[PDB]
């Protein structure tokens, strides 16, 4: 279906075995499926055809809002309230986008577990590693900021992390 992006939400190709009956007994599942298609699928398909015909006569569109990038809290001067406001709003939007990225990866993980079923521990190792990396980065970004989090606090955390990394590299080189 073109409703969602197959690249963002991958699905492995579906391999369905062909029926290979070994008995002369009729298949109750097949008979009930035929009854279901005759009694439910055709009426709902006709109803949806009518509804979509009604929708096609009044076609109209909605758009995805685009935000241009603005200077961030690193570029903002001290107590420059307008720049701080713009940077904080941009940081909040980016935080929301990152949360939704983590949600997408988790949906991938859940879908792959359910799909692979009894062989999930081996066949879902690729989606587990992506989730591990994404969650590690997201945690390092916004792990323990607090209820009153802000771009200034996140920048202070990043500065602390950078100082720790620099000290570790210097100690290793020593």
């Amino acid at each position: 279906p073109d409703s969602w992006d197959k690249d963002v939400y991958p699905e492995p190709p579906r391999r369905t075995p062909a029926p290979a009956p070994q008995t002369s007994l009729p298949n109750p599942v097949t008979y009930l499926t035929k009854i279901f298609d005759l009694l439910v699928d055709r009426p709902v398909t006709l109803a949806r055809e009518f509804i979509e015909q009604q929708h096609a006569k009044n076609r109209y569109y909605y758009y995805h809002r685009e935000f241009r990038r603005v200077p961030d809290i690193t570029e903002c001067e001290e107590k420059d309230i307008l720049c701080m406001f713009e940077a904080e709003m941009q940081w909040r939007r980016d935080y929301k986008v990152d949360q939704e990225i983590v949600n997408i990866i988790q949906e991938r993980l859940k879908a792959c577990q359910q799909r692979e079923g009894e062989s999930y521990r081996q066949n879902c190792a690729k989606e587990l590693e992506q989730f591990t990396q994404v969650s590690k980065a997201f945690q390092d970004r916004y792990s323990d900021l607090g209820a009153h989090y802000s771009a200034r606090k996140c920048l202070a955390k990043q500065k602390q992390r950078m100082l720790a990394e620099r000290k570790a590299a210097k100690e290793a080189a020593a």
């Binding site: 690193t74 001067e77 001290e78 200034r152 202070a156 500065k159």
Partner: protein
């Protein structure tokens, strides 16, 4: 006393001549409307104490209450605005004339400022 004894101050002058250069309060000022509301409340309380019908009796008396309150409120607001403008004038003059006491400071960005991070956990 901060502004008592200010140079050029004429004693017992509610509004000096230099106050004429400031914008007078509008007649629809919310503060003036609140003063009129105070006058109306005073009229209602007067009717209540004198045991007249609170809302209906003494329309002339209530109108005089409101008018007197609005009049004194307009002049009071003029004086308040003049005094605050005078305070700002003196503050700006002192800041300008004492640059060594009020120096400009180099503005550093938060990319240069180092702030300690306190995790919430």
């Amino acid at each position: 006393t901060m502004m008592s004894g200010r140079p050029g101050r004429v004693p017992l002058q509610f509004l000096p001549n230099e106050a004429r250069s400031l914008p007078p309060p509008k007649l629809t000022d919310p503060r003036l409307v609140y003063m009129g509301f105070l006058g109306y409340c005073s009229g209602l309380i007067d009717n209540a104490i004198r045991r007249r019908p609170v809302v209906s009796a003494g329309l002339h008396r209530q109108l005089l209450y409101v008018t007197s309150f609005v009049f004194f409120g307009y002049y009071l607001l003029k004086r308040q605005d003049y005094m605050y403008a005078l305070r700002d004038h003196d503050m700006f003059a002192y800041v300008k004339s004492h640059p060594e006491d009020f120096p400009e400071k180099d503005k550093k960005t938060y990319g240069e400022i180092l702030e300690e991070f306190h995790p919430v956990r």
